[PDB]
Design an enzyme around this catalytic site. Structure first.
Site, short mmCIF file in Angstrom:
data_model
loop_
_atom_site.label_atom_id
_atom_site.label_comp_id
_atom_site.label_asym_id
_atom_site.label_seq_id
_atom_site.Cartn_x
_atom_site.Cartn_y
_atom_site.Cartn_z
N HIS A 62 1.16 1.68 6.73
CA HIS A 62 1.17 2.39 5.44
C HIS A 62 2.11 1.74 4.42
O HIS A 62 1.91 1.84 3.21
CB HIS A 62 1.64 3.83 5.65
CG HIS A 62 0.89 4.58 6.70
ND1 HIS A 62 -0.43 4.95 6.54
CD2 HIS A 62 1.27 5.05 7.91
CE1 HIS A 62 -0.83 5.61 7.62
NE2 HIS A 62 0.18 5.68 8.46
N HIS A 92 11.79 1.84 2.11
CA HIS A 92 10.43 1.33 1.99
C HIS A 92 10.01 1.45 0.53
O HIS A 92 10.74 2.03 -0.29
CB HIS A 92 9.48 2.14 2.86
CG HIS A 92 9.42 3.59 2.47
ND1 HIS A 92 10.26 4.53 3.00
CD2 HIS A 92 8.63 4.24 1.58
CE1 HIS A 92 10.00 5.71 2.46
NE2 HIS A 92 9.02 5.56 1.59
N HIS A 94 6.50 2.02 -2.33
CA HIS A 94 5.11 2.34 -2.64
C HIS A 94 4.76 1.45 -3.82
O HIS A 94 5.58 1.24 -4.70
CB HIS A 94 4.97 3.81 -3.02
CG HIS A 94 5.47 4.75 -1.97
ND1 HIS A 94 4.64 5.37 -1.07
CD2 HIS A 94 6.73 5.14 -1.66
CE1 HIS A 94 5.35 6.13 -0.26
NE2 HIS A 94 6.63 6.00 -0.59
N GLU A 104 5.23 6.81 -7.24
CA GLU A 104 4.82 8.15 -6.81
C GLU A 104 5.27 9.17 -7.85
O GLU A 104 4.45 9.92 -8.40
CB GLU A 104 5.40 8.44 -5.43
CG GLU A 104 4.88 7.49 -4.37
CD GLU A 104 4.85 8.11 -2.99
OE1 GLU A 104 5.92 8.50 -2.50
OE2 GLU A 104 3.75 8.19 -2.40
N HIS A 117 12.14 3.84 -2.00
CA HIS A 117 12.71 5.04 -1.40
C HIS A 117 13.72 4.67 -0.33
O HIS A 117 13.37 4.04 0.68
CB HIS A 117 11.61 5.89 -0.78
CG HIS A 117 10.71 6.52 -1.79
ND1 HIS A 117 9.44 6.97 -1.48
CD2 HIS A 117 10.88 6.77 -3.11
CE1 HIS A 117 8.88 7.48 -2.56
NE2 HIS A 117 9.74 7.38 -3.56
N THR A 196 6.51 12.46 0.98
CA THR A 196 5.29 12.17 0.22
C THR A 196 4.19 11.61 1.13
O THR A 196 3.10 11.32 0.65
CB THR A 196 5.55 11.17 -0.92
OG1 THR A 196 5.84 9.88 -0.37
CG2 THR A 196 6.70 11.64 -1.81
#
Ligand SMILES: NS(=O)(=O)NCCNc1nonc1/C(=N\O)Nc1ccc(F)c(Br)c1
Ligand SMILES: [Zn+2]
Length: 258
Positions: A62, A92, A94, A104, A117, A196
């Site tokens: 992911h 990590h 996104h 996000e 994050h 999330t």
């Protein structure tokens, strides 16, 4: 048929396996800067990462996670809206398929190219697994990425991504200093929210920094070369691994700054 970010297993489907997806304190949210209220009782954020011990970098299917030794108070987040001490466990990102999406959280509906994050857990609960079952179990420091000048402190991460291209691959990643990923200012917004990603547990105090960091187009392009899939499977580029903004419901976003 497990959760992901595809058309058939993406955010709109998650509620079927994780009904809390439609809960009362879900993340991320849009930060309406004009509605957020300055709270003069909020303290400055205390980010103490000088003794941080990174261990490994993992493609988990992911995102990629840089993991830290959290067996002692080595890298901790304190102050701000937080009561007590929160230990850094991992960070990590996104990101999007294009520069105009990927974050996000949004700011007056603006999407950033990516979002970092840094995940911390409250040390009164002993371990991460116990912390995620508490309403004040986690603190996630969120940092926006915009595309512009390169971030020197990010390059060591970018350089190792070729070695963890596919799901389940890990590599040793010692002596990485996460202080090289922070912006100048620690001005922030904060609100009570959730993970999330599934299981979407409502255990997070979100601390989102106002100032984005700048990364180069080449740096984010290398994030987009990662794969959701495992080795020897059809290639699906790891892009658009972000959940969209969720309803604010009965929550107030507080600002640390005027
Ligand atoms: N975008 S987000 O909300 O920060 N996603 C959190 C990603 N997962 C993690 N972040 O930092 N440690 C993580 C991690 N275990 O430590 N995964 C994980 C996720 C959910 C759980 F219920 C448990 Br138990 C573990
Ligand atoms: Zn995240």
């Amino acid at each position: 048929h497990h959760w992901g970010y595809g058309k058939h297993n993406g955010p709109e489907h998650w509620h079927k396996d994780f009904p809390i997806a439609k809960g009362e304190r879900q993340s991320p949210v849009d930060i309406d800067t004009h509605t957020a209220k300055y709270d003069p009782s909020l303290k400055p954020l205390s980010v103490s990462y000088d003794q941080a011990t990174s261990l490994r970098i993992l493609n988990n299917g992911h995102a990629f996670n840089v993991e830290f030794d959290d067996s002692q108070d080595k890298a901790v987040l304190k102050g701000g809206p937080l009561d007590g001490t929160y230990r850094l466990i991992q960070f990590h990102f996104h990101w999007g398929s294009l520069d105009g999406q990927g974050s996000e959280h949004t700011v007056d509906k603006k999407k950033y190219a990516a979002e970092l994050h840094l995940v911390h857990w409250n040390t009164k609960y002993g371990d991460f697994g116990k912390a995620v079952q508490q309403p004040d179990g986690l603190a996630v420091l969120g940092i926006f990425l915009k595309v512009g000048s390169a971030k020197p402190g990010l390059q060591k991460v970018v350089d190792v991504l070729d070695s963890i291209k596919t799901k389940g691959k890990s590599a040793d990643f010692t002596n990485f200093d996460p202080r090289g990923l922070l912006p100048e200012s620690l001005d922030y917004w904060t609100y009570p929210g959730s993970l999330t990603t599934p299981p979407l547990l409502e255990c997070v105090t979100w601390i989102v920094l106002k100032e984005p960091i700048s990364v180069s187009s080449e740096q984010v392009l290398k994030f987009r070369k990662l794969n959701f899939n495992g080795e020897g499977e059809p290639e699906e580029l790891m892009v658009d691994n972000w959940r969209p903004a969720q309803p604010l419901k009965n929550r107030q976003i507080k600002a640390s700054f005027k």
